[PDB]
Subunit: 170 residues, 2 copies
């Protein structure tokens, strides 16, 4: 199919900087994704989000704003949460590529995937992470492993697109 990417929900939890929402929206659009969900964002709507969303204001316009992570994950068949610190057994830890493979398996099965991203400052709570079935870590310099929020979104969606293309022989 090609409407597969529309079944990927990008969930941003309690975003502090509105420019990161715009940046995430742009990263999404560049990769073929459209469904953005915001859980209690600090400031939204906001000019800085629009500013950073060059060519992707439509995503921001269609964004769902909710009060809880539970509400954000409603209807999903699989939830993958991002972690920049590291592993919690028994939850499996995957890299961006493995994340992409799982996403497409679920999409091909006609499921709904959710990709969860945390706060710039604190990330995701343990409680939030536990609502996920898989955890995803972007390999990085251990002394400086925290990527900008929108940049993390870009890496994941990129891998997702790469996996989707390959599944098509592209």
């Amino acid at each position: 199919q090609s409407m597969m990417l529309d079944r990927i929900r990008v969930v941003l939890v309690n975003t502090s900087h509105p420019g990161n929402i715009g940046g995430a929206a742009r990263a999404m659009k560049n990769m073929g994704l459209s469904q953005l969900v915001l859980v209690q964002p600090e400031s939204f709507p906001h000019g800085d989000a629009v500013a950073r969303a060059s060519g992707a204001t439509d995503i921001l316009d269609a964004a769902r704003v909710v009060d809880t992570l539970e509400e954000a994950l409603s209807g999903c068949s699989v939830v993958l949460g991002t972690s920049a610190r590291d592993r919690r057994i028994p939850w499996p830890l995957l890299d961006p590529r493995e994340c992409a493979t799982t996403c497409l398996e679920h999409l091909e099965a006609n499921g709904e995937v959710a990709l969860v991203f945390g706060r710039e400052y604190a990330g995701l709570t343990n409680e939030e992470l536990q609502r996920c079935q898989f955890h995803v870590h972007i390999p990085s310099d251990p002394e400086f492993g925290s990527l900008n929020l929108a940049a993390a979104v870009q890496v994941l969606t990129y891998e997702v697109r790469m996996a989707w293309l390959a599944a098509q022989g592209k």
Copy 2:
């Protein structure tokens, strides 16, 4: 072992005529997150600047060590190989590598103390035909054809991320 990590230092990130200083800071952070250190800026419109420092949270060291130059030729001096980036994956000039092939070509070239430059363009205009001609390889990140180009910092992040992924795999991870 240890000089494995030193390989990444030999990868020069070149930003050509950057308009928004936030993008310079974003690029620097993306580089640092991936283990890269060397930033070269060709005629930035505004630098140094506060937005760059802010965007480069924790990666100010890269900004500090950045070299600012008048020409691309200057920027590439001492490099071994040059890879350029193209937002368009249109057919007419010079066959394109994806980020993965790009990561591999970059690593192969780090052999025998080689120096590699990764070149990025202007937020609106990209790289000129002349600038691209200075590149031996041209890289395109696959993206939705119907829509736009990636933000400049986001593009630096994808390429540097692929470089780290290849570099890690080569070590057994």
